[PDB]
Structures are given as structure tokens and as C-alpha cells.
Amino acid sequence: MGRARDAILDALENLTAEELKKFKLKLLSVPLREGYGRIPRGALLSMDALDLTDKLVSFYLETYGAELTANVLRDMGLQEMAGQLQAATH
Amino acid sequence: ETITVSTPIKQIFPDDAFAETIKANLKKKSVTDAVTQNELNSIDQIIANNSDIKSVQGIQYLPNVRKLMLPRNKLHDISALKELTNLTYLKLHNNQLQSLPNGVFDKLTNLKELSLLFNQLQSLPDGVFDKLTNLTYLNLAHNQLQSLPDGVFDKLTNLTYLNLAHNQLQSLPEGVFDKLTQLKDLRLYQNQLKSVPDGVFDRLTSLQYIWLHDNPWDCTCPGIRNLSEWINKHSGVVRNSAGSVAPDSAKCSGSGKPVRSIICP
């Protein structure tokens, strides 16, 4: 109802600058459902957590953008954060 | 700052939600369970998102916390953090802080990154950041700031990211960025700036990205000519909300014309 965009922002601003840089790199290769776009490498370069939250909600939606963000956090080893993201959407 | 008898979690942490957080961190069954100071000492990171926390009273007892992430709670006061000298990452976005007690950050000399994004700060204390010599990340965006105290950033020599976007800044102090020679990323978008002082960005020799859009730039106001010359010389630095190079994104109010267009370069 708007809750999942908030959860994406809360998760991404929780990350260190290093972890955001690795998250954004992981976005280039993370498996996507059919028909959804991939964010170009150049577009990610200038993006803070605010900017990334908007981009993720505009490529994917609120609902799928959160599921994908949780997938990437799991592949980075940050299991605790991925749990609080998945918990907040439902 | 210590507990001398094993104590129920609920007693040390009056906030019911924060006590739940402490119990999960320590992996106990109930908040009624008894905890020792040795067990409290094992906690070095806390993550409590969207947990309806009002107070972190009792966090004074957790002297080893380095990573503190409490976004989207209802915090009005962070006094209880004054003595957590092991803090190195402090993210308090989407809370309801309206003021920082004077000297609240003077003891947090290990802080790398600080985010006060989406709070309600109407002003900053003088010298509030002077002790955070190792700070690299400072997000103050989406507050209610009316001005910046002079020299507020003068001590933050390692800062690489500074976000002042979405406030109500009407002016910037002379030389307010002159010590930030390592800054790569400066966000000033969505403020009430009519102009900036001459050469305000002149000493930022590491700047890679700047956001200047959604400010009421006055094409006649003093210092706009320097800003126009600066933009013309550093056009690739200037970004729009989509993230793209857009040196024209900074717009003269009223006419709507690019600040860049004022001079021909």
C-alpha cells in the first residue's frame, strides 16, 4: 500500500557505501523475470539509496522491486537485512 | 553504565519494542529472561527496522555496538547514544528527531557514516559535527533546515558524500565547503537558494557529482555570475534527478532559463 517502497528505502540507506556499491553491481547480473528491464551500468554510478529506491520501483514495481532487493541482499550474505525487508512487505 | 545482577530484559529496556529487539539479538525466549552484563557486551550491531520504537533507553549499557540501524521508528531523542564510543555506522533515517542535543556527537569519534535522512531537524547546533573527524558519509536530506551554522562542516576533511537536499535553505555561509577537498558527491537540490557565495565550490577539487536543480536561482542576485561560470567550466559534474549530466537543470526562477545561459563561455 506504499509499505514496500518504504521498506526498500529503509534497507538501502542501512547499507554502507561499500555495500551499496556491491549491491548496485549485483543488480547487473541478478536473474530477472521475463520482460523486465535491466538497469544500465552507467545509470547506477551516481545513485545513492534514495536514487536507487526510485529506480527500482520504476523498473520493477513496488512489490517485485522489494522481492528482487531481498534476493540481492541474500546473495550478498546480509541475511538479517533481507529478512526485515521480506517481513515488512507482508 | 553496567548491570551488576542478571536482570530481566524488560527492566533494562523500558521500550517494549526495543526490549523485543534486544531479546532477538541475544536469541533468548522471552523479554522476562534474565541477562548479564557479559551477555549485553556481546552485542555489536543492532538492526531494528519499522519496529515502532519510541525510546532506546537502556542502550547506554551496550558499550561495544559499532553498527546501529534504527530506521522508521518514532525516536525523538538520541541522548542515550552520547557514550557509545564504538559506534562507527549510525543510520537513523525516517525517525522524528527535531533537534540534536548540544554535544550529542562529541564522543563518537569513530563514526564513518551518519544518516539523518527523513527527520524533522529545523536547525543544527554550532560545532555539532566538529569531533567526527573520520566521517565519510553525511546524509541530512529531507529535514526542515532553515540555515547552516558557519563552519559546520569545517572539520569533516574525509567527507566524500554530503546530502543537504529537501530542506529549506535560503543561503549558504561564506566558504561553507572550503575544507571538503575530498568531497565527491554534493546534493543541494530542492532548497530555497536564490544564490550561493562566490567560489563556494571552488575548492572542491574532488567533486564528481553535484545536484543544483529545484532552487529559485535569481539571475540578477550577486554571485549568480560566478555560479554560471562555474557551471560552464564544470558542466559534466551537474546532474538532474534522473542521474544524468544536465548542466541546464539549475534554472533561473521566473524566466525558467538555465543558470548556465547567463554568460556565454
Residue numbers in the entry:
A (entry chain D): 1 to 90
B (entry chain A): 2 to 266
Q: From the publication, what sentences describe this entry?
A:
Assembly of inflammasomes is initiated by activation of sensor proteins, and activated senor proteins recruit and oligomerize the adapter protein apoptosis-associated speck-like protein containing a CARD (ASC) composed of a PYD (pyrin domain) and a CARD (caspase activation and recruitment domain). ASC is a bipartite protein composed of CARD and PYD, and its oligomerization is mainly triggered by homotypic PYD interaction. We developed an ASCPYD-targeting protein binder using a non-antibody protein scaffold, termed “repebody,” which is composed of leucine-rich-repeat (LRR) modules. The repebody scaffold has a horseshoe-like structure with a size of 30 kDa and high stability.
The most promising rB7 clone was expressed in E. coli and purified, and its dissociation constant (KD) against ASCPYD was estimated to be 1.5 nM through ITC. There are two protomers of ASCPYD complexed with rB7 in the asymmetric unit because of crystallographic packing. The root-mean-square deviation (RMSD) value between two protomers is 0.237 Å, which implies these complexes are rigid and structurally almost identical. Structural analysis revealed that ASCPYD tightly interacts primarily with the concave side of rB7 through hydrogen bonds and salt bridges. Both Asp6 and Asp10 of ASCPYD form salt bridges and hydrogen bonds with Arg73 of rB7, and Asn14 of ASCPYD has hydrogen bonds with Asn50 of rB7. Arg188 of rB7 forms a salt bridge and hydrogen bond with Asp51 of ASCPYD, and it also has a salt bridge with Asp48 of ASCPYD. As a result, seven ASC molecules are found nearby, causing a steric clash with rB7. Among them, eight residues are shown to interact with rB7 at the same time, and five residues are involved in ASCPYD oligomerization. Taken together, rB7 is likely to effectively inhibit ASC oligomerization by binding to the interface of ASCPYD oligomers, generating fragmented ASC specks with a low degree of oligomerization.
